[PDB]
Each structure stands twice: as C-alpha cells, then as structure tokens.
Amino acid sequence: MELLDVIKRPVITEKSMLAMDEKKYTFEVDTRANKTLVKQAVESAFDVKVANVNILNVRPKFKRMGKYAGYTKKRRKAIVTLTEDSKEIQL
Amino acid sequence: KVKEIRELTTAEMLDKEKQLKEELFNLRFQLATGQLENTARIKEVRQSIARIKTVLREQ
Amino acid sequence: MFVKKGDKVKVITGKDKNKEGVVLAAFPKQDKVIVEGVNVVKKHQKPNQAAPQGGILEVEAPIHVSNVMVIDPSNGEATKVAFKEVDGKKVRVSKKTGEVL
RNA sequence: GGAGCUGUAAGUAAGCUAUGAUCCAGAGAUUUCCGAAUGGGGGAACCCAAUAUCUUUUAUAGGAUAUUACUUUUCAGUGAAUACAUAGCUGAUUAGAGGUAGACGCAGAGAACUGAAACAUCUUAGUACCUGCAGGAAGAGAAAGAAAAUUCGAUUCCCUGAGUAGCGGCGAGCGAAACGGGAAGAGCCCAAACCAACAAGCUUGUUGGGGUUGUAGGACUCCGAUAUGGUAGUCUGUUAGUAUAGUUGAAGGAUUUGGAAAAUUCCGCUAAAGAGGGUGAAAGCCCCGUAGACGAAAUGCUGACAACACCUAGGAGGAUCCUGAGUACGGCGGAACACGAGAAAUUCCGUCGGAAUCCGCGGGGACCAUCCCGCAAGGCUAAAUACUCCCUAGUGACCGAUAGUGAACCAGUACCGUGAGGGAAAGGUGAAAAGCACCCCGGAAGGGGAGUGAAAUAGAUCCUGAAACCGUGUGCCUACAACAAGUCAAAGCUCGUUAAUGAGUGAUGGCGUGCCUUUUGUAGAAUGAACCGGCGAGUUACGAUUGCAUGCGAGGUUAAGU
RNA sequence: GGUAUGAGUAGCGAAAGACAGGUGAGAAUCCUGUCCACCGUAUGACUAAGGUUUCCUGGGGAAGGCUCGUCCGCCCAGGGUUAGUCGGGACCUAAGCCGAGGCCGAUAGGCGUAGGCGAUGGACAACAGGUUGAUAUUCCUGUACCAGUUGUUUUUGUUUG
RNA sequence: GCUUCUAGUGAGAAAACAACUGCCCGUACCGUAAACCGACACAGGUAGUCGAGGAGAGUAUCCUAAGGUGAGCGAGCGAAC
C-alpha cells in the first residue's frame, strides 16, 4: 500500500489531546499496517522524527438503529511519539 | 477531466496522481477535524485519481 | 414527463381546476409536479426550521402530472403535446395549433 | 436518452448538470481477503516463508511486484543399487483438481416399512439413499434385425396391439413384443488382405496408400474414367436477419353531485389503437400505453452466399489371399430379458474349458433336419424424446396474508440446538401529511381545546373493526329460597314496533336430568369440548360398471398426429 | 390467535438494619454521613477458561429489574485496551492428527513412509515506583537486559591462515 | 535451544565507546460470578495462585485483620396449621 494511504486520519479525543501534550500523536491507521510502516508513513507525511510507535487494534463495536443491529468497523490506532529536538505535527 | 489527462504524458500523470493522493490525505485530515467545508471534494479527488489510473492502464 | 420545469400549465382536474401557473419543480419518478398557487396546504411547523415562531406555513403540494395541461404560449389555451423534429432538435408541438413548445 | 440528479431515507451539509448530468443498453478497466486454493501452515476470511528485482533507512529492521502445491502429458537434463540401463531427481511443457439445477441422462452399489389380509419365494424395487461420469440433452443407432399376408429395411419417441400372449408360493401380483398408424429421418469410418517408403532383427515394426461387405464384399488381375455428386467440416470472411437500449404513435368539453369526476346529463370526435395500467370515485378521447410505423454505435446468436477444407468412381474375372480368438460357444455360479430354471431360446457378469472361418458362421424361444433371414466378437453419427436453477414476454371459471412459497414485511432471518438440523411471527392513515402550529392539565405518558382534512370514533397499536372478555348508565326483577335454568300459564310495572290478535321485564303456578361420541342400555359417577374467532375430513387422474341424457344406428367411433 | 376461570389468589429465590441530611414531580428501595450487623482457607486479593463491551464519563426512566426507583450489568451519546523483555507466533517436540510418493480397496475411500501439524510439557532478554475517569512488567521516571546495525578508537589475521 | 568436535567455510576478526534498529496477535471488564455452564440479576456447577491474628496440631472451630457485604418487595399482627 502507498505510504499516503497507511495513515487514515488523526484521533481527536480527551485522551489523544492529553497525549499531544507529551508530543505523541494518535492516528487511525490501515488495519493491515505494521508499526514500522506507520513510522515510515508518518515521517514522509510530516517531516518529523519518530521516537516510538505504539499500536493497538480496536474491535468492532455493536450498535443498533431502530430495528437494525450491526457492528462498527474495526480500527487500528497508532500512537506516534516524536523525538525531542524535532518538529511537532500541527493538525 | 479525461480530456486533459490524455493530453499529459505518462510522467506527468504519475506526478499528477501523487499530488492528488496527497490532497486526499489532507482532505481526510481536514475532515477528521472540523476544517473541511467542501466535503464533496473528497469524491472529486478520488475519481480524478481513478480516471488517471484508468487512462494509465489503457495506454 | 410531458411537462417540464418552467412550463406554463393549466390544471384540468382537482380543486384548483382551471387555475394556471408555472411548474416550480417536476418529480419525474413520482409523475408529480408543483404549480404556483395550486394545491396549497397549511402546514403546522414546529419552529426548529429557523422560523422563530413556528406558525402555520402555506406551501404548494405536488399534483399528479396528468391533472395538468401545458398552455399554448402563442394562444393561451391548454393543448396536448406532440413531438415533431425541428432543425434536428426534437421539440414539443402544440397539437391544437402547431406552435412549438 | 433530454432535465434534472447525489439509492432505500428522510434530514441537514456539500455538490453535479444544455461543454448533456442522473438514468438506460453493448463493450472494456479496476476487482482487497477467504474459498478447489494451489509457496508453507491453519481453529475459512489469519499467520509464516524462499528466490529474483525494486524501494525505505547511514544501516539493520520495513515496504512493493513477480515466481514457487499436487498429479498427469510430452521434451530436455542430471542420475542408484549395477556393467550398459532403469528407477529416482531438477527444470520446462501439458492438462486436470472445485462448484452446480434439490431437474433431466448413463453407470456402479443398493434398503426397509409395505402388499401378499401372518410369512421365508414373491412384492414394495432395481424404487429411496450413496458414488462415479456426463451432456445440453443423454442413451440407442445403420441388422450375425423384424418376419414367414411375403416380405420389411439403422435408432429413438407417440398412438395401438393389451391388461392380450405370458410370468407367478399359478398366490398377491407382475406384464410384453412384432405387425398397423404417426413424429422425425442419414448415414458413415476402421481392422485384415495387398502396395510403397523408412527403420530394425527373409520378417517386423512405423508411416502413407489401399479397403469396408451378405442379391457376399474386398485384395488381386484385366480393361476405363481423372469426372460427377455430397457433407452431421472452419471464430474464413461478406451479407441479411435477430437479441440486448429506444423513437413515434388518433380523438372531450361543458353540465349536475362531490373534498376530488373518470360517475351523471348534454351535445362531439377517434379507432389498423374499445388490450391493460395510472390519475383525488367507475376515463376509447388526462397520463403510461395499445394498433400501427420506425430505430442500432457495440456485442452476441442464426440463416444464407462465397471461400477454403474433407469425402464421392464403372464393368468383367475367381487361381490365390483377407473379412475382428482366448473371441463365438460350452460346463459351473449369478444376473438381465414381462419370462421367478423352467421344456428356456436371446443378452450379460465371474470361473474353467474352448470353434469354425465362405464347401464358413449366426438367428428363426429346448433340440435336429430343411428352408428362410442375416454376417457377431471394431468405432462414430443430426432429428423426432427428457428436464428448467436461470432470462424475456405473457396466460389462468389459480391464492388473496391462518390463504398463496417457510418467507408479500431486511426469512432460511429471529429463535431453538454441541452439531447435523429444526424454524416463526409480522401487509393496509390519507387523494395529498396537509403526521395536529399555538394554548391548557401533567415530570412525562396521556389527554382537553385550537387547527389540518370530505371524514381523526381516518392521529400513526392509524381502512373496515365481529365475537369472546372487561366496564359505565338503567327500564323491569331479586335478600324463606334448592334452580341443566328453559318451556307453558300469568298479575304488575316500563315501553311504542317492518302496526303485528305489539315489545321488554317478570312475582307466582305447571312441566322439565345439557350437547356430542360410544353403547343392549348414558343426565350419566363412561368419552370429548375453558370460551370466542379463523382454519380443519370422500378429492382428482386413469380404468371397470350401472342409471339418466344426446347423436347416430347394424352399426357406432376415431387415437397419436398435422 | 385472542380472552377468560382459578385471583387480586400462589409466589415475589436461603441474611440487619436504623436514622439524619441531600437529590428529585415523586424515594423503605438513589447519593452522603453515622452507628449497627455479615464474610474473612472468605462473601478478601489474583488469574486460566468462558463471556464478548458487560469497563469509563455524561444523560435517560418506555421496556427489562419478581416491589419501588431519581438507580442499574438496562436504554441513549461519547470514550477506553499502547510491550524487543508478559502470554502466543516468527523456537521445540508428546498424545493425537494430516500425509508427497506408497500399500489396500465395487465407487466413495481406508491405511501409511518421508515430511509436517499439534501443549496441557521443553526453551527463552527488566525491574521498582509513579501516572488516568477508563490501560499499564505495555505509558512516564529511574536504572537494566537480549538480538542485531552503522561508525570511531584499540588490538591481531590475512590463505605455514 | 545449548556446549563441544572436526569436516567444511574463510578475509578478516574481536574489544571498548557512541549513535541507532527490534514485526504480528492478546492485553478493557466480569471471573467461588447478576457479566461463565444451569431458559432467570436461579440456594446448583466452575481448573490454578495468595489466603492474616488470638486460642489451636490445623487452611478445624469461635471471634476478628486487610478487604469486602447488608444480598431488588415491604409495613403490621404475634390465630389455627
């Protein structure tokens, strides 16, 4: 897959916003991307230097509307920690 | 559109595609935040990339 | 449909029979159309639509397209529509007089 | 194709479209992962590699694309015991591997309940099931046939023969075939003799020629013509048609009723169109259509035409040669033939034995003779036949939501089950949402107004709205009475009708043990029903027979089929 | 299928609660406080399986909860699971399973060699504290370890190596 | 896995220090349970670890610690059974 397709979007939440204060950035990533790919994708997309990437899988969540019930899509969340002496991401 | 894509050369179409993929990356990020107004742009860009790849294949 | 947005039509059946108006919008999939000043309804709206009183709004409801006959612009009379080729452009002809549209 | 469009699904939002959008049809591109799956593994939709090239990083790690299963066919290369070899091994090449339409076909294997009023033969059945192989059809098919009217001339299927001949614990049952009439029709290639070439160890293989059968044919030897006819050949083009989008397509206005007209009345008109659907009720003339005329860039399919390919010799001679062997056939054991071993021919399977070959061989229901008909042990073959998961257009004295598919509705779903598997319920506001602004009680729910509407006692649990069941009002009766509860007689009171020698209630009096089933006999202390509603049981096909009816009558009548 | 009868009857599932204050339309039943009481080889603390969002936060009170409900493992709306070192894979094998060729067999298939799969066992590198409403040997702080990579300096070996 | 041995493989090796690289899956929560198996927020069933004090042989017993709990109908009355 292309590097520009690995990173889907940022994650903006109370937890991710807090983590930005520590210079780590949460993204939704392609479910098939390993944390090394994410590191490479982040660096090429933002010119930053990445110190560490932590990565989790998010299970699909049960939801219902009216008479219909199903599941939200599975997601893959990558927390990218930038090095010191490095540019930050500005989303 | 298709007319002007067929005018460009192979290298230009490869480059044109990478410019669109980046714009698509930015649009997704602008959509994730409350910063994207013309949300119809995303489909426009996706189909423009599709049109280029279709043309690339029929050459 | 044989009637089109912007057409001048005459209502041939309904409560508003013999009224005339312009087609404000056409609904080909429903075979319905909206005509100015025809089939008005009094709608009891809650004010959640940027109208800070709610009020009872008067709007035009659609009517079936077969209740409307297009008006002959050159003659002012309602007429059935024929399709004759002019300049290679397929156009609507007034069956009654032969005028176009 | 010509004005809207961004599905169901609104809503906001943001957009597209006369530079032609959405939409429609033909042709292409893309087509993640699992799944035969096939690089390896695996608890399907996941994990882990090799090799090559590319890419990321200073680099390792990372990423991309390609190739890599197994067996088969052919070729090449390597290459054991083991001398040459062979096997193995590596690569290439080639082709299969799974799924279905729960149908139709052929083949292997193959029940039982059941019937026989028991039951082992028999029957159910060669059916169900399982498995293999298919093909659009399959199978069969070009006489070692049917016959003995003298003849017919491949096969298949339909009518008939006929419930006949037969088979059968001669029981129950099973049950032909030929002739006759139809549908459809079509015929052909090999093996062998012999000839030629090549290769090998005079034959002994390969190739090509030759040859194809029963009034026997062919080889062979003679002469004589290189014509004439045919085809179940090919992504050979060309052409036409056709399927898959479409275009065009006549003729009505008033009046009365109504919320609305298509109803009504009045006069009109159109019809190669008075099929049908929709539209505010029931429309030939408002809409979609219909009859009719018309249309194809593209891709299929079909038919011709052309091309090309492939088949197609006559007559006379018999000296010799050929004409399917472990075959035919026989014994034994099974099976198939309607035919159950029977007097059992014919066909096949296993086992053993085992021919002739044209002066021959097989069949004509044991067998022999005679006569007649055919020529096995090699293959192929259209049509008439079977079936329909799907596609298109229709049809119905078929269903109309307890029906009709299990499923009209997000159903093979929910739900049940470890699993195979079982398997529901559930349609309707209105013409249009015009889906009740606003007010009032209430936390809300829900109501009351006010509105919308023709109608809301059409307010979404929404058409109609039965019954059981629950309640409110009250005309008459009821607190000394033992009552299948009604019926007949009857005062009093309260009412007034489909106006009838009326209606409701009823003190009191006479008489009186439900319904059904099953029984000699049931109120039965036998059975069944809680109640109400819906659903729920002699039908159809083919045959037999009788009555009635009609037609014809010593005659009556066709079946398949066209 | 609907609705009765029994009935406003049986039952409401092993146990201690009390009061004050609060919240709220409404509270025996929600919150807070106080005392009281119960478990304590546990009714505590972990964790495998199994479940699969039930976790957290903010709202809600139709239904579910055998009463009630302002509350809930319920409903609505948002969020939450971070590891070279933990457990599993890129390590190993047991039982068993699969099985190239192979052997056997009406079909289907059965068995089985090489080769594999397969833990419940073998092997294997970090810990303490802190931090959030919800994760932590995973994040952070401090201090480590294991495998490998690039470079610098230092030594010694270049085919009698 | 590991440790040895040569056979083979070899031009380079090792140490110190500096900088740097290290993938996939699980990791919420319940878990002697109202969140698992029992149709139920059901007196049943559910492997392993830790499991304190006094008296005590003890993980028995009684009462307690850390910690957890008052268990999803109540109010009266104080008949028969």
Ligand SMILES: [K+]
């Ligand atoms: K597989």
Ligand SMILES: [K+]
């Ligand atoms: K079928």
Ligand SMILES: [K+]
């Ligand atoms: K039997």
Ligand SMILES: [K+]
């Ligand atoms: K019997």
Ligand SMILES: [K+]
């Ligand atoms: K055939």
Ligand SMILES: [K+]
């Ligand atoms: K018969």
Ligand SMILES: [K+]
């Ligand atoms: K019998």
Ligand SMILES: [K+]
């Ligand atoms: K020939």
Ligand SMILES: [K+]
């Ligand atoms: K109309």
Ligand SMILES: [K+]
């Ligand atoms: K009509």
Ligand SMILES: [K+]
């Ligand atoms: K064509």
Ligand SMILES: [K+]
């Ligand atoms: K016989």
Ligand SMILES: [K+]
């Ligand atoms: K015969």
Ligand SMILES: [K+]
């Ligand atoms: K014969």
Ligand SMILES: [K+]
């Ligand atoms: K109504």
Ligand SMILES: [K+]
């Ligand atoms: K009453």
